[PDB]
Design a protein around this nucleic acid. Structure first.
Lengths: 271, 46, 94
RNA sequence: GCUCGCCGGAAGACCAAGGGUUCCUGUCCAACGUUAAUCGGGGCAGGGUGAGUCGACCCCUAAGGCGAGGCCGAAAGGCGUAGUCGAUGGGAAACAGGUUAAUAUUCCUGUACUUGGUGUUACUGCGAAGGGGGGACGGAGAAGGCUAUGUUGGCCGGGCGACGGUUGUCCCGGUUUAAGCGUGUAGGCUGGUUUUCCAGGCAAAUCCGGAAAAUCAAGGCUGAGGCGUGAUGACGAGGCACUACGGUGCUGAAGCAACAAAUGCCCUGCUUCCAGGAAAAGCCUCUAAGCAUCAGGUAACAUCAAAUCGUACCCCAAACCGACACGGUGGUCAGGUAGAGAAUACCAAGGCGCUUGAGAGAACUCGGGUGAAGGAACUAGGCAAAAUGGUGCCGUAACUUCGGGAGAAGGCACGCUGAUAUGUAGGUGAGGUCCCUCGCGGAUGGAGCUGAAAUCAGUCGAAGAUACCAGCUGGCUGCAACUGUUUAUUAAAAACACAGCACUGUGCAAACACGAAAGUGGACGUAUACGGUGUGACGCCUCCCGGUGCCGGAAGGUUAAUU
RNA sequence: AGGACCGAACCGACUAAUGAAAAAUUAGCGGAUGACUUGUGGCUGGGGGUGAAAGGCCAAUCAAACCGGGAGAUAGCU
C-alpha cells in the first residue's frame, strides 16, 4: 500500500512509501545472484555517454528468468522478493524437479500459487504459453519479440499487453505505449499483468532519495554558458532559441525513429 | 596547504616508470630521445 | 648439496666490532661478511666445511652502503651481507 | 643538579606513506645553524638493522590494465575471447620476561603453535580444468553479558615529620603476570537421525536440491569472558656489594577483594528499515575420466623444512609535501580530579621552554584589562565590542502544511554543614541454608561495597550554573520552499541543485552519446522504462498558429545526379 | 524514524582585526548519520576531459593545459 509519511522533518513531509508486507524479509536466493558493478554512465572509452548516472546503492543482480522454458514441469511460488534492479517484484519459484528460478511476479501471484509454462499449460495468471495458444483479447506480459529469445515487452512494474488479433503466423499486440505491433505467433508470453502496479504512486520526497537510486542532478542548458550548451549565455534569463539537445538537436517534438528494418512490424505508431 | 606533489612510489612507477615507457610506442620514443641526449637517469626508475 | 667451489666463494671475512665480540664471547655466535648472493643454508654449509664446526643456525642481514663525499664528488659504498652464525654449545672457533 | 613554567585526545607513545643513515659512539667548529657554540639532523672516522609465526614475497580475486587467436582500422593502432596481472579486500602459525651505546613478537630465557614434505606402522576408494557447500559481506537502533582500565579497602614494605598538630579513621610506595593447552559458560543460530524415490545442479555423483516415510526431542554448530593450568617460574617496592659515577653483580615482601566501567570483545550476533547491501581462492564435500590390490587418501610416531627481501631513525614533523631547521599529512594507543563528554580547567606517564640576548619603560602600532555621566548620539550599517550562556521545575502568542512555531517570551531554585537515612532510593552481590538432569547450575539469603535525587534545619559570602565552559531576545518585511552546491586564491547569494510538475522523443539491434570502425554505455533495463527540454515543495491557479520552429499532408508549381 | 536538534573530532570558510604563509592568523562562524567525510588503487586528455554551471577545475598556469617542433611566424608599432 501507499503510505504518506508524517512531516516530522522537511524532506520527509512529501514522502510517500509503497509498502508491500508480502515481500520476503530476508536475504535473497544466493545461487541466482551475481555481481553487477556500476558504470557511472561511462563506456569502454571511459567517457560519460549518458549523463546523470552515478553512485547509488550497491546492488546485486538477481538472475531473472525471462525465457521461461521449463515446459511441462509445474512450479510453485515460494515467495516474492525485492529486486533492486527493476520496478517490478520478482517471485522465487520451485519446480517439481527441484530447480528454483526467479520470475517476474504477476499481479495476482502469491506464495503457494502454482504456475506452468508450455503449450499445454493452463490459461491462468503466471502461466506462459505461445501466443498462438493464447486467446485473443487476453492481457499478457513478458512478451517475446523473437521466438526463443526471452521476454522483452511489458516487464515494468504494472505493464501488460493486449493481444488484439491473430492473423496467420503473426499476432498484433497493443503495446503499453499505444503502438500496435505485429509479432510472430510462436513467440512466448506470460498471462496477466506484471505485479507491482502501485509503484508509480511512490514519491521520492527529497533530493537524497534520487541520489540513492544512482541519479546525479540535472543542470538546465539555459543555466550554462554558450560554450557548454546551445541554450547557454544571456544576461539574466534569456532563451531566444528553439529547444534542443546539448548536441543541437530539436527536443520538443522532432521525431527520431530511423529504423527502416522493422518499419514493417509497426502496425500503428503511438499517439 | 596541500601542495600539488603528494609522492607515492608505486604510482610514480606505474605512471612514469621504465616498463610503462616500454609498453607503448610513444614512451619508447621518449626513451630513445633521452638516450640520444645522454641522460644518466633514463627513467624515474630508481 | 652445495659445490665446494661455491662454498669457498661464499665467505668473505670475519667481522670485528664490539657487538661481534660480545656475540662471540656470550652467545657463541660468529659474525661474518658473506657474499650478497649467499643464502643461509649455503653459509652454514661453508661454515661447517671450512671452519670445521657444527652450526645451530644462521641469521643474515643486508647492510646498506653509506653515501660518502670524496672532496666535492659524491659516492656510495657497497652493500654487503652480514651473517650471525650461532655455533653448537661447546664449539670453540679459532 | 635544584627551582620555575608549557603540552598532556598532545607539543606524549606506536605505525603506514614519504624520506633514505638523519640512528649510536668518537672527534672537529672553516662553512651550514637567522647570535655565541665546547653543541647539532653540520664536517670526518667507526659502529648499528638478526624472524618458520611481524610485513613483503606467495595463493585468491575487485575497480581496472595487458591480451594468443579474433573483430575492426591508410599506417601507427582500437576493442576484446581464452587467459594473465592488479589491494585498498579474502587466505597457516608466538607469547611473556631479559638484554645493546645503538635491533628486537627477529638476539637470549622460558613456555608454545603452523603446514609442508620424506619415512613409518595401521588401514583402505583415491582421483578435476567439473557439481555442491562455505567463504560472503548494508544502514540504523537496542540492550544484556564481558573485559581493558580505574577507584577504594585489605595486605606488604617504608615513615613519625625544617612551622602549631600528626602511633592514627595518619603519610608514601607497591600489590603485575602472556600466548598456548583444558574447560565450552553469558548468550546466538538451527529441529535431528535413518530409509525410499526423483524431468534439477552442461556428464556422473553416496554431495546439494526436491518429494515421500519412519522415529527421537535433544542434535549439532557458534561463542566473549571467567575458572584451571602456563607459573616451586618470571617481574617485583626498594634493600645490599662494587664503582671508569655511566652503571654492573647479588637479593627480593606482599602480590588479595570489592565496586565502577568503555566508543573495545560476544556481535560477520539480535531487532528493524529500504536505498536491498564484492569477488575468487584457501577450507569442506561429491563424483568423472582414470587406476585397480599399486598409487593416492587419514592414523599416529619419527625426522627434515620454512628460502628470499624489509627490520636503524623521523613520521602532525627541524628528517615527508611546502625553495628555508617555514601551513598540509591516513591509521592505532586514550591515566587522574571535576564534567554529559574524545568539550573545558588543573595534573600523570612522557615530552618540551619554540637557536639572538641585555636594558629601558617616549610617541605610535598590535593583543588584552578597567572605566564617572550618558547608552547607538557612532556609522553606509550597532562593524567591533558588550551582553546572553547550565540542570531541574513552572510557563509560553500570532500563524501553521497540525509536525511545528518553541530553548518562543518570561520567571523561580542552585554553595557548604547537619538531619531525614552513624549512606536513603536504587545498583551490585559473599558467606550461610535448600534443590540438583552435577556445573562456569538453580533457588533462598542478605554481609560487605557503591550510591544519586529530594525535603527540612542551620551556615558564610557582595556574589553558590561562582573559574574554564556556556543561546542574545522580540516585531514587520523582500527573495529562495526546505537539507544541500558554487567562482581553489576579492562574489556563498536571490545564483546551481532539489523533490514535484509539464512537454517531447524513444517498441529494443530503442532513442541518444563516445567511437573512420569494431564495439561500448543506455541496460544484463523494455514505455509504471530510458533520453531531451523547460518549470521548480505545498496551496489556488495557469486570448493569439500571422511570424520562426516542429508535426502531418501531398493535388499542383519548381527542382540534382542520371538520360 | 530523521538529507531532525545542540555540540567536540572531521569537513568547510560568513564577519573581524592582523608575510611565520605565492591565501595564512587569532577571535568568533556553518555542517557535523549524510545529496557526509576520508585512506589506498583505478578511469576520463586539450576544442578534449570533468563540471549540483562559477567559464569553475584539469600539477601555484585555463574563453582552450604543459613540453618540443613549423620558427628567426608576422609586427605599416615601440
Amino acid at each position: 500500500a501507499v503510505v504518506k509519511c508524517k512531516p516530522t522533518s522537511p524532506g520527509r513531509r512529501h514522502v510517500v512509501k509503497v509498502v508491500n508486507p508480502e515481500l520476503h524479509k530476508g536475504k535473497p536466493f544466493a545461487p541466482l545472484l551475481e555481481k553487477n558493478s556500476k558504470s557511472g554512465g561511462r563506456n569502454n572509452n571511459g567517457r560519460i555517454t549518458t549523463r546523470h548516472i552515478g553512485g547509488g546503492h550497491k546492488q546485486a543482480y538477481r538472475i531473472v528468468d525471462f525465457k521461461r522454458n521449463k515446459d511441462g514441469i509445474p512450479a510453485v511460488v515460494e515467495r516474492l522478493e525485492y529486486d533492486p534492479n527493476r520496478s517490478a517484484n520478482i517471485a522465487l519459484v520451485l519446480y517439481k524437479d527441484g530447480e528454483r528460478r526467479y520470475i517476474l511476479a504477476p499481479k495476482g501471484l502469491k506464495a503457494g500459487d502454482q504456475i506452468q509454462s508450455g503449450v499445454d499449460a493452463a490459461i491462468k495468471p503466471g502461466n506462459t504459453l505461445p501466443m498462438r495458444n493464447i486467446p485473443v483479447g487476453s492481457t499478457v506480459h513478458n512478451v517475446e519479440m523473437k521466438p526463443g529469445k526471452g521476454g522483452q515487452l511489458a516487464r515494468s512494474a504494472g505493464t501488460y499487453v493486449q493481444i488484439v488479433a491473430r492473423d496467420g503466423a503473426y499476432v498484433t499486440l497493443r503495446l503499453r505505449s499505444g503502438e500496435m505491433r505485429k509479432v510472430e505467433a510462436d513467440c512466448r508470453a506470460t498471462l496477466g499483468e506484471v505485479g507491482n502496479a502501485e509503484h508509480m504512486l511512490r514519491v521520492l520526497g527529497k533530493a537524497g532519495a534520487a541520489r540513492w537510486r544512482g541519479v546525479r542532478p540535472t543542470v538546465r542548458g539555459t543555466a550554462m554558458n554558450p560554450v557548454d550548451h546551445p541554450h547557454g549565455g544571456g544576461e539574466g534569463r534569456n532563451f531566444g532559441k528553439h529547444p534542443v539537445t546539448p548536441w543541437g538537436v530539436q527536443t520538443k517534438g522532432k521525431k527520431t525513429r530511423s529504423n527502416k528494418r522493422t518499419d514493417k512490424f509497426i502496425v500503428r505508431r503511438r499517439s | 596547504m596541500k601542495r600539488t606533489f603528494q609522492p607515492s612510489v608505486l604510482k610514480r612507477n606505474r605512471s612514469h616508470g621504465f616498463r610503462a615507457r616500454m609498453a607503448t610506442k610513444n614512451g619508447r620514443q621518449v626513451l630513445a630521445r633521452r638516450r640520444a641526449k645522454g641522460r644518466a637517469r633514463l627513467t624515474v626508475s630508481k | 648439496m652445495i659445490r665446494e667451489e661455491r662454498l669457498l666463494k661464499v665467505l668473505r671475512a670475519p667481522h670485528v666490532s664490539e657487538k661481534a665480540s660480545t656475540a662471540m664471547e656470550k652467545s657463541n655466535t660468529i659474525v661474518l661478511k658473506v657474499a650478497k648472493d649467499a643464502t643461509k643454508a649455503e653459509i652454514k654449509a661453508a661454515v661447517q666445511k671450512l671452519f670445521e664446526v657444527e652450526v645451530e643456525v644462521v641469521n643474515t642481514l643486508v647492510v646498506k652502503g653509506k653515501v660518502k663525499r670524496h672532496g666535492q664528488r659524491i659516492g656510495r659504498r657497497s652493500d654487503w651481507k652480514k651473517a650471525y652464525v650461532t655455533l653448537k654449545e661447546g664449539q670453540n672457533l679459532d
